[PDB]
Amino acid sequence: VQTVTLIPGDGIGPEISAAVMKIFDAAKAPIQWEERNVTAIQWMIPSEAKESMDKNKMGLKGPLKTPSMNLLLRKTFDLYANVRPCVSIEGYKTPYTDVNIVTIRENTEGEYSGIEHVIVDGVVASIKLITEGASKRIAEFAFEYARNNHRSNVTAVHKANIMRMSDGLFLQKCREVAESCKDIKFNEMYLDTVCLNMVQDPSQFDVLVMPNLYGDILSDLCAGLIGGLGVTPSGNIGANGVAIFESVHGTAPDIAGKDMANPTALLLSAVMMLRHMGLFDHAARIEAACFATIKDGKSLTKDLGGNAKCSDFTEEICRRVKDL
Amino acid sequence: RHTVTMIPGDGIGPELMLHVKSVFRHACVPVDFEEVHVSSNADEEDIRNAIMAIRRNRVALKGNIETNHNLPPSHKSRNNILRTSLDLYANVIHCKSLPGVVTRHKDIDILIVRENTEGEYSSLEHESVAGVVESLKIITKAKSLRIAEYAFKLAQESGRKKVTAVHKANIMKLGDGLFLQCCREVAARYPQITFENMIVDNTTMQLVSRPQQFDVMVMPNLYGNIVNNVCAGLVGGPGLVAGANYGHVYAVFETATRNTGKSIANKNIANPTATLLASCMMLDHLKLHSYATSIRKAVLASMDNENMHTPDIGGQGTTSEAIQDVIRHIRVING
């Protein structure tokens, strides 16, 4: 029974953080919550927070309000791999029904290198950085994720036709890892083709690995295929075995305390959390109990949406997770 | 009679140029194609003489030259070399829902205006030390102003009402910021046109759910690559949508998605619609508007008939059967 640094965050942060804990022990989970506040000071994040995370290794983070803490937590814990598994959800139906993609985004260098120069008046050069080190590391993580999560194919996504030196070296590191891991089927594809086919037949894609800006855009389009950021789990993996799993929707301050929110997304990042540790049994139950709640009917939130409030939704998940 | 440069390209390009000639013959279009070819050769003499022919002719219709991304960075994409050498700064494509092609989303009518010469297509890279590669995306004021002018003039002349600038200025603060601000400046000269803006991530999310909210869109080069292909796919795929490339004097027409289609080439299954619509836009540009309209109504009429559909859009017919139907629709328009 280990401890998980909890970061409720602002607006609807606390309510959906309450809903996740309620379901987490309604379901026998060997997890106890060590709440914490994260915030820039002096910048920095508090002593309070840096040492919980460097002790527990596992955090779950709600919607923070808006130095970028997105960027702070990345640089403070070396969050180098953004993971977003998108799965169509029965009951919450979009025009796309067959989706099951995992996007794996390099999260340190790439187009978000922070280097821009004004070359002269009216002429800006923004510098994209691609390194042997980081590309190899996100590729190793991509293939390791594919095995441990029983995944058949890993596609590298690139534009090495246009950006030959940089996207090329990213690709070169994906190739070297793939020849050292023939268990998993590897292909390459241009970003524009991946975009073109995604909105036509998303079902043909398995694990997508790609550098920073492409991963930023694709992860969002995929989540748009399954229903939005209100239903999307996300995780970030760092150095020395730290990992932070999170909401990525807004705080929704205008309904912040009216039992009206929907905790699906953070609850699913928690599920994704357990799976990361171990505890698949608990994950499968919580997840299945969630999936069955959304499909069965009018116990639905307003934003998904029915006319039931957040802890009616949450309590039915508790009701059903107790009957494995 | 006009003389047009024709670059057949790779993949489905060659076969589809033949049907373009064939359709122009039946319609008696006063246009003579002057073909130039571009090989795989690392040497640039092919691509350079294609450029000089377009300088001579001012108008061209082209397939897609394949780019081998396994060759060294010195071997740059010829499609890009053409685009930038000739300074065709505006990539324009028009994605509109085709009533005969039923997809997940209806009521789509989006003009996309894409800066076509600058950006992350500048081909400026270097390895400072072993394993450390830098690439310089270039945004300038003169080119951001230029593209923004075009999108707004387009929006007005075609009676649209909203331009949406697409960008990553919240993270690419200087580069994308400069582009966004050039748009804003132009916006202030078109008070009658609603100006909005949106981040490229959230734009792709809105496209796959509510793409009816977009009217005209303008953006820098890579984001256009993404948005063109997203919207091409939404309305039915790469065989349907034409694209144009405009400079101040030169103009070059093609398929919107810029794909060679090597995996379906030479099996008489390619969809000729994108290529045909591209050649009508070329006819409009040449002020041959009556020929453009005859052929465009024919091709569109054929898409209405499910029986004419190629496999890219769920059908079973051949290219040649589609071209047959198109010619049948022209052969009654002109007597």
Side-chain angles (χ1 to χ4, degrees), chain A residues 1-41 43-324, chain B:
Chain A
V1 178
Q2 51 259 29
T3 312
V4 163
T5 304
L6 181 52
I7 304 190
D10 317 76
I12 65 170
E15 183 171 301
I16 69 190
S17 272
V20 168
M21 303 183 290
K22 184 174 195 196
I23 296 170
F24 251 61
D25 226 350
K28 217 80 194 46
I31 301 292
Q32 249 186 334
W33 307 107
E34 179 197 50
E35 280 206 24
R36 204 53 82 222
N37 182 89
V38 76
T39 289
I41 48 174
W43 305 74
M44 274 180 339
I45 57 141
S47 315
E48 295 311 291
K50 156 88 163 164
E51 207 85 287
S52 324
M53 214 73 77
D54 272 313
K55 177 182 43 223
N56 293 341
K57 264 83 190 63
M58 303 283 314
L60 184 94
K61 182 192 121 297
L64 301 201
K65 223 194 247 192
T66 57
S68 185
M69 274 176 282
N70 191 300
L71 167 56
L72 253 187
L73 296 153
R74 176 227 308 184
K75 263 175 95 140
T76 301
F77 299 122
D78 192 21
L79 302 179
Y80 75 92
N82 184 255
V83 181
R84 194 173 294 193
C86 309
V87 179
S88 276
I89 275 149
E90 281 313 345
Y92 187 43
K93 196 217 309 216
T94 66
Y96 304 84
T97 71
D98 42 343
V99 186
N100 193 298
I101 310 162
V102 176
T103 54
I104 294 183
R105 199 229 283 196
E106 193 299 323
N107 201 42
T108 85
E109 50 181 40
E111 285 102 338
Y112 304 159
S113 83
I115 308 155
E116 297 196 288
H117 301 297
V118 170
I119 295 300
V120 279
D121 201 10
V123 172
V124 175
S126 315
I127 295 203
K128 171 180 167 142
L129 178 67
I130 293 288
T131 62
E132 187 154 53
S135 286
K136 179 186 206 145
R137 172 147 103 151
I138 189 71
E140 278 163 357
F141 179 88
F143 274 87
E144 194 225 29
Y145 178 97
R147 293 203 263 111
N148 302 353
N149 288 251
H150 307 112
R151 289 264 140 184
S152 35
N153 291 258
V154 166
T155 320
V157 181
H158 65 110
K159 297 283 300 192
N161 42 355
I162 292 317
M163 275 161 270
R164 181 82 37 71
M165 203 165 304
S166 57
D167 283 15
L169 185 120
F170 179 87
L171 222 45
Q172 183 207 327
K173 310 318 289 189
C174 289
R175 292 166 175 196
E176 292 166 358
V177 162
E179 273 133 36
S180 290
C181 214
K182 311 238 66 181
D183 297 334
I184 312 296
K185 216 222 281 163
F186 172 80
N187 60 320
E188 305 164 347
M189 200 166 318
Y190 294 131
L191 176 69
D192 41 1
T193 295
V194 177
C195 295
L196 180 66
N197 296 333
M198 188 82 71
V199 306
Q200 287 186 284
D201 183 9
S203 75
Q204 66 154 110
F205 289 107
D206 198 343
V207 171
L208 269 38
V209 59
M210 72 212 73
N212 203 336
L213 179 280
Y214 310 153
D216 192 19
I217 300 173
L218 271 192
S219 62
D220 274 316
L221 174 149
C222 285
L225 302 181
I226 78 179
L229 305 170
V231 298
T232 314
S234 167
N236 299 275
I237 272 63
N240 321 314
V242 50
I244 311 178
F245 302 73
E246 65 180 331
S247 208
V248 292
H249 55 73
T251 61
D254 57 308
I255 62 146
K258 294 192 350 193
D259 203 12
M260 226 158 176
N262 159 33
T264 315
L266 185 75
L267 169 58
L268 276 143
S269 321
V271 176
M272 186 187 157
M273 173 165 42
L274 302 156
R275 292 198 163 114
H276 188 256
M277 266 136 354
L279 293 53
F280 301 93
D281 276 19
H282 292 104
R285 305 190 220 127
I286 324 175
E287 160 160 61
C290 185
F291 286 162
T293 309
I294 301 182
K295 187 200 237 140
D296 194 274
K298 52 230 204 203
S299 208
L300 279 201
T301 325
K302 195 115 201 222
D303 47 64
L304 264 171
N307 235 324
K309 277 108 72 177
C310 167
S311 209
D312 290 341
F313 178 97
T314 308
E315 242 287 328
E316 173 150 7
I317 299 181
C318 311
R319 197 221 91 193
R320 313 172 68 119
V321 71
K322 290 163 172 165
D323 309 328
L324 168 47
Chain B
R1 281 190 88 73
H2 296 262
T3 299
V4 165
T5 287
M6 172 181 273
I7 304 168
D10 306 326
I12 48 174
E15 80 204 53
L16 287 193
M17 291 315 191
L18 299 178
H19 300 294
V20 172
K21 287 158 170 242
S22 169
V23 171
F24 273 21
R25 280 179 227 117
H26 270 85
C28 303
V29 181
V31 165
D32 305 300
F33 287 111
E34 181 180 299
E35 295 200 12
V36 191
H37 299 80
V38 174
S39 67
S40 47
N41 285 331
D43 190 273
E44 285 191 3
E45 75 180 273
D46 281 351
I47 194 63
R48 291 304 168 164
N49 194 74
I51 282 137
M52 272 144 29
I54 297 158
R55 295 225 162 84
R56 194 192 321 129
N57 280 323
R58 291 177 140 81
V59 181
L61 167 81
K62 76 181 280 300
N64 198 247
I65 309 172
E66 216 205 311
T67 305
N68 183 349
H69 69 257
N70 300 302
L71 295 158
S74 64
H75 188 115
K76 289 126 51 152
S77 147
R78 275 69 184 113
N79 303 297
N80 199 17
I81 293 183
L82 195 272
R83 247 187 257 135
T84 76
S85 289
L86 290 174
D87 204 36
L88 313 156
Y89 61 87
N91 193 19
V92 179
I93 88 174
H94 180 177
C95 296
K96 195 172 187 306
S97 267
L98 295 185
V101 180
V102 166
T103 69
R104 296 164 220 263
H105 310 269
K106 62 164 184 23
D107 294 302
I108 287 167
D109 186 344
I110 300 176
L111 272 160
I112 304 153
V113 185
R114 169 219 194 163
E115 211 291 323
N116 212 18
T117 66
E118 210 192 45
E120 39 275 85
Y121 287 67
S122 293
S123 312
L124 302 170
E125 304 175 304
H126 67 279
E127 188 157 272
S128 59
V129 301
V132 174
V133 173
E134 280 179 24
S135 182
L136 310 200
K137 170 176 185 194
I138 301 311
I139 303 303
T140 68
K141 180 170 185 171
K143 297 199 188 210
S144 301
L145 280 173
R146 189 166 57 164
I147 197 62
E149 297 284 3
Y150 193 105
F152 264 94
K153 183 174 176 190
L154 195 71
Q156 193 191 255
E157 296 183 345
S158 78
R160 329 279 301 209
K161 285 172 27 83
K162 169 169 80 177
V163 180
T164 297
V166 174
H167 64 89
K168 251 296 193 202
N170 71 301
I171 297 179
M172 252 66 48
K173 275 182 234 278
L174 287 201
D176 280 12
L178 178 47
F179 172 86
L180 183 53
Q181 194 68 214
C182 296
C183 295
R184 286 180 172 140
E185 294 189 4
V186 178
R189 289 193 291 275
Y190 292 75
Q192 77 281 8
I193 302 279
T194 305
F195 179 64
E196 313 208 323
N197 77 74
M198 202 176 296
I199 288 172
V200 58
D201 310 46
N202 179 50
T203 292
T204 75
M205 251 192 268
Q206 296 302 320
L207 283 161
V208 302
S209 46
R210 203 173 115 237
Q212 302 72 11
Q213 60 181 317
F214 295 115
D215 187 358
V216 175
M217 309 184 53
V218 53
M219 55 201 77
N221 203 344
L222 179 53
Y223 313 155
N225 189 227
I226 292 153
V227 172
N228 284 349
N229 280 284
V230 161
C231 302
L234 293 173
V235 299
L240 303 175
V241 182
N245 303 250
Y246 298 117
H248 293 289
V249 46
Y250 310 133
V252 170
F253 299 87
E254 64 186 349
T255 56
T257 41
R258 291 196 178 148
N259 54 303
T260 88
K262 69 186 156 121
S263 89
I264 64 155
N266 301 308
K267 302 165 166 154
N268 190 14
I269 52 180
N271 191 327
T273 305
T275 286
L276 281 166
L277 289 172
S279 80
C280 298
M281 301 206 296
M282 185 196 82
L283 286 192
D284 280 318
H285 182 79
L286 286 177
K287 294 331 189 236
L288 296 155
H289 302 300
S290 82
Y291 298 89
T293 299
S294 283
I295 293 162
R296 178 161 39 230
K297 283 209 198 122
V299 317
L300 285 174
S302 99
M303 277 303 103
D304 273 49
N305 182 352
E306 176 185 66
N307 295 310
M308 306 300 157
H309 286 189
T310 36
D312 48 297
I313 51 156
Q316 288 167 296
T318 55
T319 310
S320 43
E321 286 165 284
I323 293 294
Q324 180 184 16
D325 198 52
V326 160
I327 285 168
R328 185 181 12 240
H329 281 103
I330 299 162
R331 291 203 293 201
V332 283
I333 284 181
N334 68 340

